[PDB]
Design a protein around this ligand. Structure first.
Ligand SMILES: [K+]
Ligand SMILES: [K+]
Ligand SMILES: [K+]
Ligand SMILES: [K+]
Ligand SMILES: [K+]
Ligand SMILES: [K+]
Ligand SMILES: [K+]
Ligand SMILES: [K+]
Ligand SMILES: [K+]
Ligand SMILES: [K+]
Ligand SMILES: [K+]
Ligand SMILES: [Mg+2]
Ligand SMILES: [Mg+2]
Ligand SMILES: [Mg+2]
Ligand SMILES: [Mg+2]
Ligand SMILES: [Mg+2]
Ligand SMILES: [Mg+2]
Ligand SMILES: [Mg+2]
Ligand SMILES: [Mg+2]
Ligand SMILES: [Mg+2]
Ligand SMILES: [Mg+2]
Ligand SMILES: [Mg+2]
Ligand SMILES: [Mg+2]
Ligand SMILES: [Mg+2]
Ligand SMILES: [Mg+2]
Ligand SMILES: [Mg+2]
Ligand SMILES: [Mg+2]
Ligand SMILES: [Mg+2]
Ligand SMILES: [Mg+2]
Ligand SMILES: [Mg+2]
Ligand SMILES: [Mg+2]
Ligand SMILES: [Mg+2]
Ligand SMILES: [Mg+2]
Ligand SMILES: [Mg+2]
Lengths: 121, 139, 129
RNA sequence: GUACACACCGCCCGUCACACCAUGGGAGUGGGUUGCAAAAGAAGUAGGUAGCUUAACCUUCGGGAGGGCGCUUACCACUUUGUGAUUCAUGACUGGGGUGAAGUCGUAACAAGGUAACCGUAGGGGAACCUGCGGUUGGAUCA
RNA sequence: GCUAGUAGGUGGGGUAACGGCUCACCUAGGCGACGAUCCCUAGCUGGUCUGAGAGGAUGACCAGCCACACUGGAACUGAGACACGGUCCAGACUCCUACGGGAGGCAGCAGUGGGGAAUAUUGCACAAUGGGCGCAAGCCUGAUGCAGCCAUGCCGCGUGUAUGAAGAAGCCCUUCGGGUUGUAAAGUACUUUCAGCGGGGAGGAAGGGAGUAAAGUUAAUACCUUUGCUCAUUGACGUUACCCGCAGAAGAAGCACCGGCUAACUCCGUGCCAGCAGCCGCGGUAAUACGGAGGGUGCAAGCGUUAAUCGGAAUUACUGGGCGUAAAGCGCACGCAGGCGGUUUGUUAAGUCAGAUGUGAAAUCCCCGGGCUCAACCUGGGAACUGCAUCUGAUACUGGCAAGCUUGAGUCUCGUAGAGGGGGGUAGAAUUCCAGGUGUAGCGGUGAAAUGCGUAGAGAUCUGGAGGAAUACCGGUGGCGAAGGCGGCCCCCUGGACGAAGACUGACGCUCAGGUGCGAAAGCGUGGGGAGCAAACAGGAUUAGAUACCCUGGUAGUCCACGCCGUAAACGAUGUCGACUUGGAGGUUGUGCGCGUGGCUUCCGGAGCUAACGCGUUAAGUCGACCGCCUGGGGAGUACGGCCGCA
RNA sequence: AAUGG
């Protein structure tokens, strides 16, 4: 680009879109579970990972991963979601915060308890 | 459906105000069931939701989850074969479905003799049955 | 078409040094002769000579050291497309002083060193190191 | 030569089936903003003055001056009407796209890939594609 | 494209004042590609965050400025308002009522409901600072000073110190020997911050009073004022900061992580499950990756996670990037605006440069110092604020102006080569067809066949005729053209290029958004033409199938005139112009004297360049001018909108 | 110069 060309049209930056649009620049967001189900990961991984469609207070419905082993989440449950995609689950871009609101902590957890909402044993 | 959101909030508040008022969702039927100390009680609660909470709701008899069972004992063979397109898949199993004592539950028996069915495939056989039994065989 | 004769001179010098040419010739001009004088006094060129009246021709005799061109670099700074004028405080230091920068000042075409002493800035013609 | 490297028992394309996501079109349906053409005219201010009334000044003591009220006009807010523009939401149904199984149908490309491939265009066909016309080498082969 | 009080003028009115501010009249202006108008978004700044910097992001708290006060209007009063806690009108909404009528505006401080992931007490004092009123005393002050809550941040500190080895127990590992946990423990000495208890006790307090004396004051020594002097008092915080004593180690450690990136590894579960996961990836018989345990590592009253900004990212490259094959040269050209421009003299000084002066709030940042026990924090001074004005100079370059000059560019004179273009005419070969003759059973086709053709005489051969399309050989890394393209021969009209030797003009140039023109094939419209060929279509084969490839047929089209379409791997995948930089071997077309000197072109190759391949005086080398264009793969050159088209 | 491997 010549200076004259740049005079006519300046250098343009990038949009830099977010990977967590539903949060709307918020650390966490409350929501209600519309369907708690399981899905299979894409190749090469293999399992039955647990997910839940959740309608946010902002009015966005998004699939959020329920981390840990076992969950007390049923339909019509008030949960707090946060940012964090699941690489092998296409579409899942959010993670439920265990131990906040209805969502209970992972039972029988002795490591990384803070990340699974488990009080000090 | 718009009221459903408001209904949730309404139930929470009502439950806090009145101890004897209870609300829960039956997982099987996927139905929120309200509990009270009488017809008059629940009537008042419902009307309060309709006005104060502005949630138009309709009450009714709680749906009942039914189960099924086999009345007769029979031996049946199940066979699969798919060689139509490229890779071929085959499997055959001879199973006897006998009525179990009520309450005992599913009791899969591996009576395979001479390894006619490979040991590795036997767990899958049970898994297949369990999944099929989870689904209705009648209604 | 030709729109920068100074850069043409600088290019001929650089191309000459690479081709190990004894001397380069070009159409003469007051500014070219001015710059030639600067290079000669700094010992970047051996000597220069202008011949002709109707069409004066400037011949620059190039100097090589240990079989290596004395001029290692000669880059035009201010160009027709982008003129560059620096103040005396903003004067550049080519190769941390080891190289020279030809600056056109009101008092005349001179090195960055000369201009800095005289307390005069101006158009930075080129950097010769 | 090559798009192969558990190395041609390689790699690899599209339809159809199923699931899911985002999205275009869509009789329309509900909002926001706004243009133009009008209508309207509270309060206030200014102007004028049918009438009505009046502390300070003047006066022949009657009045006069001046003021107020009232009325009227101009400006103008709400509001109203018609007709456009724009934007947002939503819509029976419909088009293509993306992702996912280990479904089905073929094998189009990669070797000359078994009809070299590809580009523009036209016609045709379940699909990958096929055929014509011109162009390109980003084809191999020559003993 | 926009504008009609619009743009300007004249006069009057109006304002504190200038002014289309307003009005009458006159003129037809004004604005806009240096982006008007319209649409979307938003308080601005000092500053904050990030960055080496240039920048990027951002504008809570602090300070300056602006705007706003239920919503939409409007004045009034006043020095000042079109006024948070004023008025009037209208509206929305709420409230009180005796139902006859009234009332209200937390975007002041608390506080409530609601919304949300989420943000605190309906606190104390006017002691201090500051403000209103007043003669003063004083009064008012949710300003302000303090207190409350919150790990929300920054900073400081404590949770002990020393000793303590068979180093116990236990745990864990184990090579079943030991080892590790680990001086860690226990034990033995020992000090108590901080906490708690009790005791003592700064500074923020200056003033204002009562007066008492002096001076002034004037008639007065009155009064009052001023300055000394005396005396009693003036704190919310506050049970203050801080100091002393008290006894006791008491009352004080958590969180994440250990496959690599990246500091920290084993055992045992689980067995592509259950799980993990920033990225790469792990998990199907032990998995330092999951689950749990031991041990280790990093941080610490915090530790993680999520969100967010900048950096790293030279990944929008001004600093500081690219376009032969990776994304990227418009199909080609002309040309306006624009950008840039050869050499000389004078002149100006616009840019540029120098100096002076004014300004650039404070705070903040930085530096050097102080005060807080230290730090955080507070404070003195300086530097800085990179800028913007103005005045006086310099004038090299750039710009302007004037006069120039050939070297760029162009004109004229002469000659040469060419499938350059447009129009018309004509020749030969061949195919097909038509008519006739001769002649007899095959012909034709394929990998092999078949369909098809033929005794209703084919095919072959000969003669005559018809019509359309294309031009063998020459012919070529030949030539010509901006590109697309252009090939029998002849005539007519016309473009460009190149060479030789002069003359002439005098920078007249280069590039070019927009714009305009040209632009293979296919296609489209109208009217012709139609031999051959051939999309579609039909039949025969092939094949598992064969909407194909092959065979037999065959229509549009291919041709012409005129109009439209505007695209191709329209490719050298290489924009145009100019200058410069080793060689060798060829093709083609001039010119001079076997040797030269021009134009164009092919191959090879040096330096250099390149990721490599390669390119290499016809650059992809070295530079300058200008234009176009790119910023992961898909989605997609698609959707929508506009423009164009008969489609 | 069959076709599929
Ligand atoms: K759809
Ligand atoms: K093909
Ligand atoms: K084609
Ligand atoms: K006006
Ligand atoms: K307002
Ligand atoms: K650059
Ligand atoms: K021009
Ligand atoms: K000058
Ligand atoms: K035909
Ligand atoms: K261009
Ligand atoms: K993308
Ligand atoms: Mg729609
Ligand atoms: Mg009125
Ligand atoms: Mg193929
Ligand atoms: Mg092929
Ligand atoms: Mg090919
Ligand atoms: Mg076909
Ligand atoms: Mg071509
Ligand atoms: Mg705003
Ligand atoms: Mg950058
Ligand atoms: Mg790059
Ligand atoms: Mg490319
Ligand atoms: Mg090109
Ligand atoms: Mg100047
Ligand atoms: Mg000049
Ligand atoms: Mg000619
Ligand atoms: Mg054509
Ligand atoms: Mg055919
Ligand atoms: Mg044919
Ligand atoms: Mg194109
Ligand atoms: Mg191209
Ligand atoms: Mg041009
Ligand atoms: Mg080469
Ligand atoms: Mg398109």
């Amino acid at each position: 680009a010549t200076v004259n060309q740049l005079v006519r049209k300046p250098r343009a930056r990038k949009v830099a879109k977010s990977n967590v649009p539903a949060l709307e620049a918020c650390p966490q967001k409350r929501g209600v579970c519309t369907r708690v189900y399981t899905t299979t990961p894409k190749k090469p991984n293999s399992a039955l990972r647990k997910v839940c469609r959740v309608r946010l207070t902002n009015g966005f419905e998004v699939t959020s991963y329920i981390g840990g082993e076992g969950h007390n989440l049923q339909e019509h449950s008030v949960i707090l979601i946060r940012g964090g995609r699941v690489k092998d689950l296409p579409g899942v871009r959010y993670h439920t915060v265990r131990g906040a609101l209805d969502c209970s902590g992972v039972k029988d957890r002795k490591q990384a308890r803070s990340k699974y909402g488990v009080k000090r044993p | 459906k718009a009221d459903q959101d408001k209904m949730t909030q309404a139930l929470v508040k009502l439950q806090e105000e009145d101890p004897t008022f209870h609300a829960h969702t039956d997982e099987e039927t996927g139905q929120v069931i309200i509990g009270g100390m009488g017809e008059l009680h629940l009537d008042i609660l419902v009307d309060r939701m309709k006005k104060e909470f502005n949630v138009e709701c309709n009450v009714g008899a709680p749906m009942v989850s039914y189960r099924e069972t086999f009345k007769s004992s029979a031996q049946v063979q199940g066979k699969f074969s798919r060689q139509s397109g490229g890779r071929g898949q085959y499997g055959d199993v001879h199973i006897e479905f006998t009525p179990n004592e009520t309450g005992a539950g599913f009791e899969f028996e591996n009576a395979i003799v001479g390894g006619v069915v490979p040991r590795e495939y036997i767990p899958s056989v049970e898994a297949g049955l369990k999944d099929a039994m989870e689904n209705g065989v009648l209604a | 078409s030709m729109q920068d004769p100074i850069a043409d001179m600088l290019t001929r010098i650089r191309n000459g040094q690479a081709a190990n040419k004894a001397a380069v010739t070009m159409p003469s001009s007051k500014l070219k002769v001015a710059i030639a004088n600067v290079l000669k006094e700094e010992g970047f060129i051996e000597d220069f000579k202008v011949e002709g009246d109707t069409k004066p021709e400037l011949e620059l005799t190039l100097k090589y050291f240990q079989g290596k061109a004395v001029v290692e670099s000669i880059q035009r700074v201010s160009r027709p497309g982008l003129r560059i004028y620096k103040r005396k405080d903003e004067l550049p230091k080519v190769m941390a002083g080891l190289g020279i920068a030809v600056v056109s000042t009101s008092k005349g075409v001179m090195t960055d060193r000369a201009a800095r002493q005289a307390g005069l800035g101006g158009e930075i013609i080129c950097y010769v190191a």
